[PDB]
Design an enzyme around this catalytic site. Sequence first.
Site, short mmCIF file in Angstrom:
data_model
loop_
_atom_site.label_atom_id
_atom_site.label_comp_id
_atom_site.label_asym_id
_atom_site.label_seq_id
_atom_site.Cartn_x
_atom_site.Cartn_y
_atom_site.Cartn_z
N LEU A 129 -73.15 -47.40 4.49
CA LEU A 129 -72.75 -48.80 4.31
C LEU A 129 -73.84 -49.63 3.63
O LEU A 129 -73.52 -50.52 2.86
CB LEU A 129 -72.39 -49.44 5.65
N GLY B 121 -81.43 -50.54 4.48
CA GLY B 121 -82.40 -51.61 4.63
C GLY B 121 -83.84 -51.19 4.41
O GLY B 121 -84.10 -50.10 3.88
N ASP C 137 -85.42 -63.69 10.65
CA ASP C 137 -84.97 -63.10 9.38
C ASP C 137 -83.58 -63.59 9.03
O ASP C 137 -82.74 -62.82 8.57
CB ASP C 137 -85.12 -61.55 9.34
N1 LIG Z 1 -72.52 -54.10 12.31
C1 LIG Z 1 -72.50 -53.92 10.99
N2 LIG Z 1 -71.30 -53.79 10.38
C2 LIG Z 1 -71.26 -53.51 9.07
N3 LIG Z 1 -72.28 -53.32 8.23
C3 LIG Z 1 -73.46 -53.45 8.86
C4 LIG Z 1 -73.65 -53.74 10.20
N4 LIG Z 1 -75.01 -53.74 10.52
C5 LIG Z 1 -75.59 -53.46 9.38
N5 LIG Z 1 -74.72 -53.28 8.33
C6 LIG Z 1 -75.05 -53.00 6.94
O1 LIG Z 1 -76.30 -52.32 6.88
C7 LIG Z 1 -77.23 -53.09 6.08
C8 LIG Z 1 -78.64 -52.89 6.60
O2 LIG Z 1 -78.63 -53.08 8.03
P1 LIG Z 1 -79.70 -53.95 8.81
O3 LIG Z 1 -79.38 -54.13 10.24
O4 LIG Z 1 -79.64 -55.30 8.15
O5 LIG Z 1 -81.10 -53.19 8.64
P2 LIG Z 1 -82.57 -53.47 8.07
O6 LIG Z 1 -83.50 -54.06 9.09
O7 LIG Z 1 -83.14 -52.13 7.63
O8 LIG Z 1 -82.41 -54.30 6.77
C9 LIG Z 1 -76.68 -54.51 6.13
O9 LIG Z 1 -77.21 -55.37 5.13
C10 LIG Z 1 -75.18 -54.25 6.06
O10 LIG Z 1 -74.73 -53.97 4.73
MG LIG Z 2 -81.39 -56.72 7.03
#
Ligand SMILES: Nc1ncnc2c1ncn2[C@@H]1O[C@H](COP(=O)(O)OP(=O)(O)O)[C@@H](O)[C@H]1O
Ligand SMILES: [Mg+2]
Length: 325
Positions: A43, A46, A154
């Site tokens: 999906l 990060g 953040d």
């Molecule tokens: N609960 C969720 N449902 C759908 N997509 C999600 C969800 N959590 C994360 N994502 C996807 O994963 C990406 C990276 O996750 P994230 O939690 O933001 O991690 P990081 O700290 O590495 O940036 C998000 O920008 C989004 O596209």
């Molecule tokens: Mg993020």
Amino acid sequence: GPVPSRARVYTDVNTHRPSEYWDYESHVVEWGNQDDYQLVRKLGRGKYSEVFEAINITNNEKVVVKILKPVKKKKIKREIKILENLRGGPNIITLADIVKDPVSRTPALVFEHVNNTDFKQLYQTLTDYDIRFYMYEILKALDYCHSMGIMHRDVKPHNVMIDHEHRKLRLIDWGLAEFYHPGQEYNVRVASRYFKGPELLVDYQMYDYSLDMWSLGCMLASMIFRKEPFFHGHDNYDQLVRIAKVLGTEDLYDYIDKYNIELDPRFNDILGRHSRKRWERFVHSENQHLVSPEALDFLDKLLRYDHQSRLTAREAMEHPYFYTV
Ligand SMILES: Nc1ncnc2c1ncn2[C@@H]1O[C@H](COP(=O)(O)OP(=O)(O)O)[C@@H](O)[C@H]1O
Ligand SMILES: [Mg+2]
Ligand SMILES: C[NH2+]Cc1ccc(-c2ccccc2)c(Cl)c1
């Protein structure tokens, strides 16, 4: 040295709580078996994670699996404890499970699934009402986590999942979040560049929940003015210059004087001198349908140099911009 500062709300919420709540270093994490989850597709990817859509094979339900690149163990424990503490909170992503893959031993956080609408697609279809509705939803999440003694640190569009069809919003990515302890000095290398509050850019470590309110203000300016990001710095030093080009250099000096901040020598050389700009000057043909006097007054009370002067999430919820919604 710099003058001390503390949050105007939820100041001592963690001080009056036992150790168990905030001592993430002593938290016992119990990791389940990832075999209950079948990974479907990627999906997102990060800073230190790989996010996959997955199926829980024990109930045929769709979930999201965040696979963590094993960085500092204390950081993973911090994110788990915060998510466990905030679990069930309004518009807060729900941590459903914590697992480990048997062969790789890599840690992974299991979340409720969110059917995320594209940032560009949302950006071109949102109305004045949609912006007010979603801003209020983010405010519920922020007032809630701040009340629970946590600062997200953040806040940005990419950390806010929106299922527009179901008008469902979730504040995600709690990997930088931290427990607020009055008078504590925090790492200023948090949040994404465009969303960093002036307190981080001037190296003022005694910040609080109010940092999240600035980030929220940056997101609101980008939405109503259709300029993403609103403060487009190319580096951390230039980020403060972009803010100074709008808020003015006069109020920046009043801010650093109030907190007796030792401003980096380099800044006087790149800051220049700038007048405070009126919010109306950002109004144009492409964004006038999203702007209103209430929106401008609300934005003005969020984007302020002085973190203490900024509105709290509960105060922001009482603002006239939210009356119609
Ligand atoms: N609960 C969720 N449902 C759908 N997509 C999600 C969800 N959590 C994360 N994502 C996807 O994963 C990406 C990276 O996750 P994230 O939690 O933001 O991690 P990081 O700290 O590495 O940036 C998000 O920008 C989004 O596209
Ligand atoms: Mg993020
Ligand atoms: C889907 N992720 C990106 C995204 C897009 C728009 C918003 C947004 C909408 C209205 C008001 C304020 C922000 C947010 Cl939070 C995130």
